[PDB]
Design a binder for this molecule. Structure first.
Ligand code: EMC
Ligand code: EMC
Ligand code: EMC
Ligand code: EMC
Lengths: 234, 234
């Protein structure tokens, strides 16, 4: 009751901090145990965190998204954000936010890729894996039922919840495509995996990127038109 | 020199155990450190393990694949196989082996899904995530260059290496499709993600599964024809 109240509230820094504290109190409750029953319970509580992250991304409150990793205790943080996921979470959040907002139509803009260290994380193949692992976790937290009671991805938006999740998960999939096909975008096999995208989605992406490359670093620009050209061919 | 010698050898239990020991000695060398430079080095060494796993799968030596997790020290094992990945590795190996062999054409057969606990791991959404995370790691270990010197996925098979990796990674992708679209196979969006599959691949899958459902548990059978029907529609 105390929990379901919070999750249903409008998304603020207050409602976010209290919720994470509750999950952690619940998450902690499994750390003394080390069996298999403990791991599955912990694994669900873990993606309850990512639900809250995915909510913030889809609600255009990215500053709240970064705050999630802060409210999480270090031992819990080591298990929820394993290894290199910890180091690239800042970049993953930005990447997921950028794409999701585009898919929701948000008339731009988004910070540089070479400034927020996102373009840097791309050039490391092991950082792309840790980013991809996070994007995947973002996606599954809103597809699966992480709570024992149904919760809308965006508060108050019940009747359109199935539509929102569909939209968000597609965005999180295209963000996953950018990662896995870095510098191999225009290759035939890479383009075949753009078949999932709606035709309107591609146009929204082509436009938002074409408008996003203006004045940017050449490296980011060439990265973008590799993406755009891959969109224009699918 | 000592390393590259081993990896190039024919795949046996002897050559596999020594290699894992070398990676671990190298992997250990980063555990005392906890910086960011340590994490990337460790993250690469980690997917060197999965390269060896992916080699065993593609070489139809699945018993060697399971042995990998055994030769890995528990502290190293906690970081390479995080959380629930540890518990479902046995299932992931089998799933990856089953599909890869099919893609390589191997005229069957493969153990039950309800016997090896694979069908059981499916019914848990958090186990599917841990399996998907492993399948993804299997795939990226052979796409990326995990060693500082080029190594063929299958020893002696140099000129056909790009072809093998292409084949294996597609299999590991279809194994990834089975996981993420469990009990939602025939849905339109799930079918659109079968576009990557070659037409011959689909037929090989349809046939190998049609022959795999004979006499099986009803649950596995209904799971299979959901897969087959999703293949027959794409
Ligand atoms: C709560 C068992 Hg996956
Ligand atoms: C730790 C993500 Hg369920
Ligand atoms: C070896 C730095 Hg990613
Ligand atoms: C721990 C997989 Hg590079």
């Amino acid at each position: 009751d105390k929990f379901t109240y919070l999750l249903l509230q409008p998304l603020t820094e207050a409602t976010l901090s209290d919720a994470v504290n509750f999950i952690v109190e619940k998450y902690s409750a499994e750390l003394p145990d080390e069996g298999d029953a403990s791991l599955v319970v912990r694994s669900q509580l873990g993606c309850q965190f990512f639900f809250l992250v995915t909510r913030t991304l889809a609600h255009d409150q990215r500053e709240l998204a970064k705050l999630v990793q802060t409210l999480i205790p270090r031992p819990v943080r080591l298990e929820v954000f394993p290894g290199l996921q910890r180091s690239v979470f800042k970049s993953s959040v930005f990447l997921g936010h950028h794409i999701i907002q585009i898919f929701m139509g948000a008339k731009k803009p988004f910070q540089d890729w070479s400034f927020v260290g996102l373009a840097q994380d791309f050039e490391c193949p092991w950082r792309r894996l840790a980013i991809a692992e996070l994007l995947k976790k973002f996606s599954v937290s809103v597809v699966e039922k992480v709570f024992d009671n149904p919760v809308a991805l965006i508060p108050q938006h019940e009747s359109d919840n199935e539509a929102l999740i569909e939209l968000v998960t597609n965005a999180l999939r295209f963000a996953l495509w950018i990662v896995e096909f870095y510098e191999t975008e225009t290759n035939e096999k890479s383009i075949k995996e753009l078949a999932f995208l709606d035709h309107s989605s591609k146009t929204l992406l082509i436009e938002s990127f074409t408008k996003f490359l203006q004045g940017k670093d050449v490296k980011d620009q060439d990265h973008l038109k590799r993406i755009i050209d891959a969109l224009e061919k699918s």
